[PDB]
Structures are given as structure tokens and as C-alpha cells.
Amino acid sequence: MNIFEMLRIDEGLRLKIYKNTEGYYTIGIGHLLTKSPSLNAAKSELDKAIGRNTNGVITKDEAEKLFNQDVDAAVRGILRNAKLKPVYDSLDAVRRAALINMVFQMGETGVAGFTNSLRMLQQKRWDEAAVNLAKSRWYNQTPNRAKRVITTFRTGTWDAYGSVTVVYQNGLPVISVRLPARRERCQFTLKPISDSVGVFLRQLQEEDRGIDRVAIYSPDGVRVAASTGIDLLLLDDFKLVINDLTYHVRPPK
């Protein structure tokens, strides 16, 4: 787990233009296009960012490239900023990623407005920061995200985020999932030919009382049919949604 997997979870993946929860036009993995309320302003901005005529639509490659630029921008924004850099340099990798997340969501300047929180973080005072961050326009606008980001600063662990990975062992695919607020990782061995998506999903549910929703989607956000055999599933990437969160899974081969 790292900054890129973390932001994938927080931000999801969309190949069409959409309104985020603040209601601004966005695409890709959390790429804000404009704060303008015009959809043409937004299509216009997209075309500039990609360097072609998209008609509001991009490819998975274009999303990852853009995402990669935005993260880079966010790190370079921290290093150029005089309030942010000291804090960033004091922090371990996991807490650094929490900060970059914040910068990525609300810019260099919004984040430097958090003078007390930042001081507390520099001073190693993890709960006092957490409590303080928890009282902010940020937390109010996007509380679920903010809680996750705050838990990362509080703890210095990846506990608020989850996981999904796919590995072969004996020629069988093995899927491991660590859920948010869970110490234990859990794994699932499937039979490629005879097992299907729905079988795997029912097992996922069976494993934890805390799961109220599970689904698989293509990267395009189209639901994969439950009856689809696991061998077909693993020919490409897919999105596994578990409660609120989405995990972009990238099987080998």
C-alpha cells in the first residue's frame, strides 16, 4: 500500500466526465477540470489536459498518465511550499502519503491553512492533530475520506484503507483481501474453470458480517455478470467494490 493505491481508493476511476460530491466537473482518478459550472468549460479543459478531442471521454492509459502527473504536482507543491516542506520532511512514509492525499484533494494552499494541525504533526502529536483536523470545512465537506486520511495520520498504518491482490499458487488464482479497520488479511483460492464471479462474491460476503455490498465492474464501470467464470474475469483488470470503497485489481498475465 502506498500513496498511489491510497488515492486510487479515495478517488476511484472514471473515463467519462462527472460531478464530484462538491459538484465540480472531474474525470479520471480525481482530476478536477474546473470549478466552473459549465460543462463546455469542462470539456474544453479536458481536451487541453489530454492534448486531443475527447468529447468528454478518455482511455485507461490517459487516466493513469494524468493521475501520475497530479501526484507529481502534489509532491512538488509540498516541496516548494515553506509551511508544508518541514512537516513533510519530519514524517514517515505512510504519514507523508496522508499529507500528499490532502494536497491532492485541496491544493498546496488550502492545506497550508492548517497551521495548528501541521505544528502538532511536526511535534509528533498524532491524536491532537487528528482531533484538530476533524474540526474543519474539509472534514465537513467530505467526512468519509477525511476520516480515512485522519486515521492514517493518527496511526501511521494503512488500517483505514483496504486491499485486494491476485497471485497464482499451484496454477490456481488466490485473491487476498485486507478490509478497512481489520488487522487480518483473508484469502480465497478459486478454480478458474468451474468457479464464477458470483461464487467468489458469495464467499466474500460469507467471510464477514461487516459487508453489506460487493460487486465487480470492468474498468469502464460496467457490472460483470455473476455467472462469468473466474478464468474470464482474470484476463483483464477489474474493479472490486466492497461496501463504499472500490479496489482496482490488476491480475498477472
Numbering used by the authors: 1 to 163, 1075 to 1164
Quote the passages of the study that discuss this structure, keeping the authors' original sentences.
To elucidate the structural basis for the impaired activity of MCUS92A we determined the 3D structure of MCU NTDS92A with N‐terminus T4 lysozyme fusion at 2.75 Å resolution. Overall structures of the NTDWT and NTDS92A are similar with a RMSD of 0.60 Å. Interestingly, we found that the NTDS92A induced a conformational change in the L2‐L4 loops. In the structure of NTDWT, hydrogen bonding between S92 and D119 maintains trans‐conformation of the P91, which is located next to S92. On the contrary, NTDS92A breaks the S92‐D119 hydrogen bonding and induces conformational change to cis‐form of P91. Overall, L2 loop conformation in the NTDS92A moves away from L2 loop of NTDWT at a distance of Cα atom of 5.6 Å. Sequentially, side chain of R93 forming hydrogen bond with E118 in the NTDWT moves up to the position of S92 and makes a new hydrogen bonding with D119 in the NTDS92A. In addition, L90 interacting with hydrophobic residues, V88, L115, I122, V125 and I153, in NTDS92A moves away from L90 of NTDWT at a distance of 2.5 Å. Thus, we suggest that a conformational change in L2‐L4 loops of the NTDS92A impairs the mitochondrial Ca2+ uptake activity. In addition, the NTDS92A induced a conformational change in L2‐L4 loops and impaired mitochondrial Ca2+ uptake activity, suggesting the possibility that S92 phosphorylation induces structural change and charge distribution in L2–L4 loops resulting in the modulation of the MCU function.
